[PDB]
Ligand SMILES: NC(=O)c1ccc[n+]([C@@H]2O[C@H](COP(=O)([O-])OP(=O)(O)OC[C@H]3O[C@@H](n4cnc5c(N)ncnc54)[C@H](OP(=O)(O)O)[C@@H]3O)[C@@H](O)[C@H]2O)c1
């Protein structure tokens with residue numbers, strides 16, 4: 470499908486990749502964008518074609534309220550996410566793993582469940598912004614990795630359930646992007662503008678598993694070519 | 707790491723694969739097995755462990771400081787899709803057992819394993835690597851557990867603890883009563899889990915279905931996805 474004339478909802482639209490997606494959807498001729506934010510005061514772009522909607526994706530009531538006000542949706546981009554950057558065992562915060570799972574898996578799932586009825590009725594597409602770490606843990610962020618892997622399996626199951634109803638479901642798997650989430654990750658990081666372009670370009674390709682950037686491509690190719698060798702290298706300190 | 711002489715703990719020891727593992731560990735010479743069960747010979751120490759109950763997990767670890775082998779076998783499959791689930795919280799229930807419960811066990815027992823040296827085997831599922839639509843929330847919880855196993859493997863490798871995942875297809879236990887044949891016999895599954903300690907692989911695929919899916923996810927990925935999902 471085309472961006473031109475679509476009715477989109479983007480979560481996490483107040484900053485980072487989501488703010489970039491909001492701006493690009495507008496520039497490329499979207500009819501309307503529901504800009505999901507946790508505090509409407511956080512949004513700097515509230516002009517024409519933008520409908521700010523309060524959505525903490527972990528809050529089932531806010532998600533339901535948003536879906537009921539967005540029955541014209543044709544494109545959902547599940548962009549909101551949380552990376553607490555902690556290992557699974559030696560975590561400073563033992564509850565961080567549960568918080569990441571709550572946003573990246575249960576929150577995305579809440580959005581899928583609430584917005585799918587309208588997408589089935591209208592036709593359309595869902596893009597889930599996951600991570601290359603859905604495919605392999607980085608030990609220092611292994612609980613983020615686990616939450617994104619759960620979200621990838623969920624995206625596969627949702628694709629199967631929605632395929633007979635003409636709703637396309639795409640996963641995008643990036644390496645590091647230059648946003649506040651990765652403030653502590655050393656460069657090189659993908660520029661937001663490049664990441665925005667790659668997310669939106671996924672609608673024009675045929676792949677439902679889309680790797681963004683060199684790191685993500687290298688990991689996917691290495692896992693296919695020699696899974697065991699790559700694991701032994703990446704997971705032995 | 708031999709089973710002979712080891713001190714093992716296996717969860718889910720009252721039925722299915724865990725009960726088979728308890729029996730085989732004894733036959734193969736474990737000097738002591740902490741048999742984790744939800745409702746309770748001299749080499750067997752029954753221990754009350756709901757793996758989602760952090761206090762029961764902590765109490766069990768405090769009474770198992772001699773452990774050298776942990777087998778995280780307990781698991782739950784609600785067999786529901788992610789979107790049209792009959793129970794909207796089935797996904798949360800599976801995540802609680804298969805991810806958070808296994809994580810609780812890893813966190814509580816790792817200190818003694820680091821002190822004694824030893825190994826952890828996590829019984830996951832081939833569905834950690836790809837969803838089946840009718841069981842996609844089970845798949846998600848096992849994929850979470852697989853990434854967690856990888857992270858734990860890296861954290862524990864410098865501290866004399868080997869961490870292995872086992873990824874079976876269907877096994878002939880109560881969990882898979884509604885999965886049609888064919889299913890791996892419990893005894894074959896037991897042999898494959900315990901043989902993992904003598905092999906060098908960090909991921910062990912159990913049975914022909916699991917091996918075929920693993921091969922396809924590396925070498926035939928787009929077509930395998932289409933076959934399972936669309
Ligand atoms: N290196 C990277 O940055 C990187 C790499 C791979 C994948 N990704 C993924 O890319 C996506 C965008 O992240 P980013 O890089 O733009 O990070 P970011 O700058 O930290 O922005 C994260 C966004 O998610 C929102 N969010 C977090 N928890 C939320 C919740 N419970 N409900 C609603 N919104 C919530 C934040 O809202 P508030 O402003 O209200 O906090 C913010 O808008 C995420 O899914 C992330 O996992 C990022």
Ligand SMILES: NC(=O)c1ccc[n+]([C@@H]2O[C@H](COP(=O)([O-])OP(=O)(O)OC[C@H]3O[C@@H](n4cnc5c(N)ncnc54)[C@H](OP(=O)(O)O)[C@@H]3O)[C@@H](O)[C@H]2O)c1
Nearest residue numbers: 718722723744756757779780781831876877879880881882
């Ligand atoms: N086809 C299959 O059977 C299959 C396929 C792939 C992977 N696996 C995995 O193999 C492992 C063993 O399952 P199984 O085949 O032996 O199934 P099973 O016969 O149904 O046994 C499941 C076991 O898990 C225990 N358990 C569940 N929730 C628990 C909790 N909160 N705390 C403690 N114990 C809990 C059960 O305890 P109670 O008896 O007290 O309920 C039971 O001992 C699981 O991790 C499963 O996911 C099985």
